[PDB]
Design a binder for this molecule. Structure first.
Ligand code: RQF
Ligand code: CL
Lengths: 287, 305
């Protein structure tokens, strides 16, 4: 029992964090094999100082790929795990290992918002901090932190240097677009509540996908597609509540609120747990 | 900017997780130097759990009855002893990944990271607090016994909790790393229940100071309160009494924001009376009590926005 915002164990990523200094700027780098990946806004080989713990790495080459700088070093990282670079979609979740001066300070779980920003927790020196998921023994790197926006939210790139969202890497007038709620994630979290014995919000009603989307559009909720309904299939079979049966419950919560009640200890509808996160946390998948 | 429930990086602890098997029971162990620490109920059957005599069960065991697995390598058990509710298995190999560590017993209101494990394999990490009723609101399934709670200050891991059981209300109970339970719990399947829980007042105040640091002041008012009047109001909402120690501990956050502790206590009184009126504080519609004054100073910027 219990339901927490759970991050993946960060150990495989901690063994890759380095400090990158160019002139007066200091930020974080990701050391994989003989390459150090970091935001290009950090800017010859000896101008770049790379520090791994208390050891100085010697830079022997440099190249740029989109908004990421690739520093060729003379030493392969002996702690390099099995890895892939993957680009995630809005609504998908990941773990963030927040670092300062190449030293990891914390780990938290978060989601890529529909407006491509992340509601993270970062301070000056956090640039180069990475987002990831783990599937068996393979680390899938999906995010590298680049900047904070005026509303306190964060923007960054995949590990190939391509930004998530209509953002650029520079000090200019940039604002996050109007955000929306990740509907498929709210439904997954309602199924997690039923699994943990919280059923006060269930009702006898069912709805159509079209009627649900007409209502959900009024509350700044993302449209629910047939793919989302298919993805919620396992949780629907486990609890006995059809997806459009659960949509009628969410429609009632949207038009009436919670009436002083909570769901999984929350007074707001939670959207940062995917259908896969719910199944994984209510099963026991290890790495 | 931003404020998240942050756990410590779990790497130093992952390198200590092993699987302990005794008969048909399998749970997690903590491998530090040449000792594996695990719940003593690993020697029990489900039948034994009603009234287990651990001393009688342990005397019937020899070293080779305990199977310890570290990754894909079998560790050889060369000794065993019991310390309160924890079993200490002496093994023939020191853990090469043993970090700098201490065993610390925490008090209610303190926070820590939990590395949830199954079969000696870590599956996730989350942050939580020792509740005033000595339980933890964790997320654990069958096989999670032996998972540990910790803090990492500097490069030293302070182990403070080892998971032993789930109570009927879904909450969790466990011990420090010396085998002493937190709370009036026993490692028996007895009809024992968690006492009435209360809100950690000093942590809610710390989180209100964190909101002011991140630029939010909608909840402040022009009033103050005496400590006694604050406690008479707070105890009506099931909030823990605020002591002079708590007021002293909030000193740095008060000096950083310019809001006296008792002026922050007046805002809290008003928040309890009025609710939030559709507003949120640090993205939350409830008053958050799982961030200590120390966590706020560690996570927030030293410059108030
Ligand atoms: C109400 C669920 C737990 N009760 C059981 O079915 C049996 N149970 C086994 C064990 C225990 O509590 N194990 C678990 C520990 N954390 C999360 C669990 C979650 C789950 F679903 C099942 C088991 C869990 C235990 C140990 C001790 Cl010291 C005292 C009593 C027990 C005990 O009662
Ligand atoms: Cl403490």
């Amino acid at each position: 029992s219990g339901f927490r915002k759970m991050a993946f164990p960060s150990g495989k990523v901690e063994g890759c964090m380095v400090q990158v200094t160019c002139g007066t700027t200091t930020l974080n780098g990701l050391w994989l094999d003989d390459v150090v990946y970091c935001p290009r806004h950090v800017i010859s080989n000896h101008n770049f100082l790379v520090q791994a713990g208390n050891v100085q790495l010697r830079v022997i080459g440099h190249s740029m790929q989109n908004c990421v700088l690739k520093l060729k070093v003379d030493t392969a990282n002996p702690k390099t795990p099995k890895y892939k670079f993957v680009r995630i979609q809005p609504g998908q979740t990941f773990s963030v290992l927040a670092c300062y001066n190449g030293s990891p300070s914390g780990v938290y779980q978060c989601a890529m918002r529909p407006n491509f920003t992340i509601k993270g927790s970062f301070l000056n020196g956090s640039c180069g901090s990475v987002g990831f998921n783990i599937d068996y023994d393979c680390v899938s790197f999906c995010y590298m932190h680049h900047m904070e926006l005026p509303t306190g939210v964060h923007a960054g790139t995949d590990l190939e240097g391509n930004f998530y969202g209509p953002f650029v890497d520079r000090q200019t007038a940039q604002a996050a677009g109007t955000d929306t709620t990740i509907t498929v994630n709210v439904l997954a979290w309602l199924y997690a509540a039923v699994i943990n014995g919280d059923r006060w919000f269930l009702n006898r009603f069912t709805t159509t996908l079209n009627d649900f989307n007409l209502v959900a559009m009024k509350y700044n909720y993302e449209p629910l597609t047939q793919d989302h309904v298919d993805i919620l299939g396992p949780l629907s079979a486990q609890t006995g509540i059809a997806v459009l049966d659960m949509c009628a419950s969410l429609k009632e919560l949207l038009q009436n609120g919670m009436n002083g009640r909570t769901i999984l200890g929350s007074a707001l509808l939670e959207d940062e747990f995917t259908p896969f996160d719910v199944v994984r946390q209510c099963s026991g998948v290890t790495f």
